[PDB]
Amino acid sequence: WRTLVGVSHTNEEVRNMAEEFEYDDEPDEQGNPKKRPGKLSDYIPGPYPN
Amino acid sequence: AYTSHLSSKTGLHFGRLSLRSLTAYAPNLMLWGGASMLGLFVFTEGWPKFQDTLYKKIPLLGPTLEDHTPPEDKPN
C-alpha cells in the first residue's frame, strides 16, 4: 500500500483504502486468532484465499 | 686571512627525514590536507548527516539539496 503514496494517491487516500480491508493480526492473550484493519505496510490482498 | 678549519653544524635528522626537508614540504602538506578534505567532502555529499551539518551552509547552493515535497506524498 505504501508504494501508491505519492505516485497515484495521497497518504490519507491510501490509508482509507487500506483500512477498508482486514488482515491477520497477532493472536491475543488467550491465543485466539485476531483480525486487523490494514495499514500502509501491508500488501494489496487478492480476492481468493488459495 | 687564511682558513685552516671548516667550522660547521650537522643539523637535525632521524634518517631520511630532516627538518629542512619537512619545512620544504610543509605548505604542500597543508595543501594536500586541504585536497583530501575536499575529496571526502565530495565523497560524503549524498550523506544526510553531513548534508545537514556542513553542506547546506553554502550561500547559493543552500536549498539545492533540501526537499520541497509536502508530507502528504511520503508513506513514512
From Swiss-Prot, chain A:
Residues 20-50 are annotated as: Disordered. Residues 20-29 have a biased composition (Acidic residues). Signal peptide: none annotated. It is found in: Mitochondrion inner membrane. Belongs to the cytochrome c family. Component of the ubiquinol-cytochrome c oxidoreductase (cytochrome b-c1 complex, complex III, CIII), a multisubunit enzyme composed of 10 subunits. The complex is composed of 3 respiratory subunits cytochrome b (COB), cytochrome c1 (CYT1) and Rieske protein (RIP1), 2 core protein subunits COR1 and QCR2, and 5 low-molecular weight protein subunits QCR6, QCR7, QCR8, QCR9 and QCR10. Present with 39900 molecules/cell in log phase SD medium. Component of the ubiquinol-cytochrome c oxidoreductase, a multisubunit transmembrane complex that is part of the mitochondrial electron transport chain which drives oxidative phosphorylation. This is Cytochrome c1, heme protein, mitochondrial. It comes from Saccharomyces cerevisiae (strain ATCC 204508 / S288c).
Curated annotation (Swiss-Prot), chain B:
It comes from the Eukaryota. Residues 1-20 are mitochondrial matrix. Keywords: Electron transport, Membrane, Mitochondrion, Mitochondrion inner membrane, Respiratory chain, Transmembrane, Transmembrane helix, Transport. One of its GO terms (cellular component) is respiratory chain complex III. Present with 5590 molecules/cell in log phase SD medium. Component of the ubiquinol-cytochrome c oxidoreductase, a multisubunit transmembrane complex that is part of the mitochondrial electron transport chain which drives oxidative phosphorylation. This is Cytochrome b-c1 complex subunit 10, mitochondrial. It comes from Saccharomyces cerevisiae (strain ATCC 204508 / S288c).
